[PDB]
Structure formats: structure tokens, C-alpha cells
Amino acid sequence: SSMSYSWTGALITPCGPEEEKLPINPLSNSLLRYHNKVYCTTSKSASQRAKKVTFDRTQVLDAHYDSVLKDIKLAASKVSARLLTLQQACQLTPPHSARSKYGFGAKEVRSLSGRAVNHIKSVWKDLLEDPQTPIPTTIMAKNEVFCVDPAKGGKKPARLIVYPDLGVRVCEKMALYDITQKLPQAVMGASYGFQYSPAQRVEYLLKAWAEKKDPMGFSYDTRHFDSTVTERDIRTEESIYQACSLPEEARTAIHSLTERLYVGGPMFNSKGQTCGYRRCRASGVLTTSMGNTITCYVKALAACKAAGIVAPTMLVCGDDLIVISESQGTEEDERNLRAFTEAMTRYSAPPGDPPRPEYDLELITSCSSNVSVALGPRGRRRYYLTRDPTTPLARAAWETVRHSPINSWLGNIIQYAPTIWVRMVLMTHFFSILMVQDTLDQNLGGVNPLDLPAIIERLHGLDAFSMHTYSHHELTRVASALRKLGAPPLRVWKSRARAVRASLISRGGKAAVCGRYLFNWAVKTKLKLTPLPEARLLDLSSWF
Ligand SMILES: [Cl-]
């Protein structure tokens, strides 16, 4: 039926110069040695990504799909969604969102400057007036960092990002922001994945697993998911949006954005040249995450019905899916998964690695992460979220004239606090660096490092400071990632941690509380860690 993209043959070009690694990486050359292995995707590889995501889709739906979609619209019809004022939409624009072609950017939009508001008013007018003319978009290579992997072909090519002008992006929110905030929860319930913190994600997967008499689980890796979303899926999304109770102006806007932007359009490079034409999901529109989550969910739940998955409990996150169900025995479970893959493939959601059933929760990886287990201070099993530390370590070593990795370190320390790699490696390094810089109470992206113990207790529980006897998989993977990146082994981080702990303790105050709580693992004579009052008086509902 339809190709995902066409190409004029024009280069996908950068926005200015993309920047060289340097000969010394002073913040990270004591963390790891093999800096040669750390790389950033650039436009030089955009052409190669284009090839991998340009292909034919044909889609065949069926009674199971139709039934799931019908249930979903009924669930949607219980939502009431308001327009946002132009001004509210403007205030929701992020601080460094890409500037508009019409002589203004994020700062002007967020201060409701006159010409910004004027332009947006006219953009919105035209959305109400013209429900047809395709809206132009810019195509760019994303710049992301990874560690080279010879197993899987050296260096990944850059992902492509496709987006309309800042004015339009503001309009999208006027039409759809309230929906983006209400629909997934309304349509999917506990299955909507973005509502959970790591600890909660673990709790959900564990309750799901315990509820089945003989559980089986799998993840579904979907290949270039954005490229496999069809016009029809996109129009079916509009149709789900339109099931909700909406003002009429919203409807026209939503319909018009659907037909003019979402469904597809032409793509221009940064130098202005016509680059191609798109008939799939754009990465850089407001509905991307919501859309992918909803469509992935419909397709997947239909596939479960097609394939005979019994009593399924799902967790969905854009293109990432995990399903835990009642096993029918291995021979059948293998059969049903093959049926699932066949159904998804028919629905235009074909797999990357084909799925496989598992009967141990540590062996299921989704959102690049998995559940593992360790023991707590009183001897009890403690489950937590973890992941391969390779890419976090590579990004911990990305250091240029224009980028500092310290933030990235902190993101991982918080999200993955209970892991052995965060506790023994990243935490040891982060504090060591800040101490020597004497910047231990700077403010990183809104967080004050000396509050970590509070924050971690709130997010992960006090047991995060007292876990031991990590799993074989985890010990193996962490040892192996350190070796792969030429970082010191754990043995050495332990010495470094003893030293970092001492200096923290010796400065008293919140620093010493960090030393005591965060590095209790590093000393023979364990202190008894008690709840932190500063932690009760703290609400991080905001972040998840
Ligand atoms: Cl315990």
C-alpha cells in the first residue's frame, strides 16, 4: 500500500558544526579509559538511517482489532477535554525549544511577547480555516552517545527527528495538551507505563506476576515503530481523540492537525532544500508518545486475543511493551507468541528480535531495563529496577566544549540508586569529582547533590542504602561493562568509596549525611541507618 518515506536525494544536514571529542577528558578519565569506544551519532550517518526506515507497509486488520478499538473509544468517551488558551500553551513551551523561522524563540513565547502571540494567533486561524494543506517540517539527525558494539555492527546511525515550526507546536498544545494529560490513563488504566516511578514499575510487575497461578511473561521489541505507523492508524487516533467530549473549535483543530501534520507531509533539511515526504509518525510532534502508546496498546491487546494469551496484564510505554499472562505450558506458549508476532506483523507492527516467552522476571527486558533482586539489611528479598550500565557509562564520559556529563551522572544516580553500578561506581565518582571541585552544593538541573539521601529514601526506600548479595546476572553484567569500557573493577571502587566517604564525613553537615547513608556499603562497621525526616517532608509526584 504506502511507503513510510520518499526522498528527493538532498542531504539531511546539521544545524551548525557538530563537535569533536577532545584529547583530554578531565571529568571522566578517572572513571574509564577506553574513550575511543564512546561516540556520538551525527548527520554523517543520517542517510543510512533513512534506508533502514524507508519501506512498504500493508496492513490487514481483523475482528479482534475492531473489538479492542471499540472498547477503547467507549473508554475515551468518558473523558472531557478542554482547549488551552494560546497563552497557557505558550507557557508550556520548554525553555530551549527550537526557535521559530519567524524571528522569535522559546524566550519570547514564554514571556507572551507581542509578535510571538500575533504569529501564533494567525497560525491557529489557518488551522481553523484550511483543513488540507500539508504543513512543512524540518528533518534532523539526533545526536546521541553510545559505546561501540562489534557484536551488532560498530556504530549505530543517527535517529531522525521530524518537526514543524515552533508556532505550530504551540498550536498543537492548544488543541491537544489537555488530551495528552487525560486520555492514556482513561483508555489504559494501570497499563499506561509513564505513570510509574522505577519502584512502582517493579511493584506493578510483581503484583501482575503473583496474580497468575503459573505466570509467563514477554517483551515485544517492535522494529522502527514510527515508520510502521500508517496514515490509517493516525486517522484512527484522531477518531479516538474525537470520541472524547470536546469543544467544537478543538475538533476542527484536531482534525486539521491530523490531516495536515500527523498523517504526513513534506520534509525540508536545515539548509532549506526539499528533502522528502513522510507518510508515518513524526518524532517531533505533540502526539508522538500518546499516539504510539495508544496504538501500540490496541495492536498488542488485539494480538493477544488473536494469539490466545490468557489473562494478560500489560505495561505500555510508547513502542515498548511487556505482557505477563497465564502460561499454557511451554509448547503452547511458544506457539501463541508466534501467533502474536504474526498478528502484530499483519497490523503493521513487526518485530525486531522476535519475542520469546520467559518464566523468570529477571530475564525480561523492557524500556532498556529489568527487574532484579538482592537482599536487604534484615535478610529479606528486595526487588528493584536495573539495566545494562554500558550506555549510561558511555554518556558519563561525554565531555566537549559545549557539554558536561555531570547532570547525566546525577540522572542515573537517582533513577538507578539501588543498583550496584550506581552505588559503587557512579556515586563514588560523582562525589569524588564534586568534592575536589568544591561544588558539592551547586545546583544541578534543580537538584542539590547534598539532598540525595533524602531524595533516594523518598523514591526507593531506606533499603536502597543497605542492599547486598546482588544476583549473578547483575554482578556479571556490571563486571563485564566495566571491563568493556576500561573502568576500574568493583574491587577498586570500593577503596575509592572508603576514601570518598571519609572526606564526606569529615566535612560534617549534609555532606557527612551523604557519606554515612550513601556509602554505608563501603565500610566494615555498618552504621544503623534510620529514616530521614527531611524525606517525609518532600513530594516527588512531579517527576512521574
Ligand atoms: Cl530486609
Curated annotation (Swiss-Prot):
Mg(2+) 2 binds at D221, D319, D320. Activity is up-regulated by PRK2/PKN2-mediated phosphorylation. Residues 215-333 form the RdRp catalytic domain. RNA-dependent RNA polymerase that performs primer-template recognition and RNA synthesis during viral replication. Initiates RNA transcription/replication at a flavin adenine dinucleotide (FAD), resulting in a 5'- FAD cap on viral RNAs. In this way, recognition of viral 5' RNA by host pattern recognition receptors can be bypassed, thereby evading activation of antiviral pathways. Binds 2 magnesium ion that constitute a dinuclear catalytic metal center. The N-terminus is phosphorylated by host PRK2/PKN2. Homooligomer. Interacts with non-structural protein 5A. Interacts with host VAPB. Interacts with host PRK2/PKN2. Interacts with host HNRNPA1 and SEPT6; these interactions facilitate the viral replication. Part of the replication complex composed of NS2, NS3, NS4A, NS4B, NS5A and the RNA-directed RNA polymerase embedded in an ER-derived membranous web. It is a single-pass type IV membrane protein. This is RNA-directed RNA polymerase. It comes from Hepatitis C virus genotype 2a (isolate JFH-1). It catalyses: RNA(n) + a ribonucleoside 5'-triphosphate = RNA(n+1) + diphosphate. It is found in: Host cytoplasm; Host endoplasmic reticulum membrane. Its cofactor is Mg(2+).
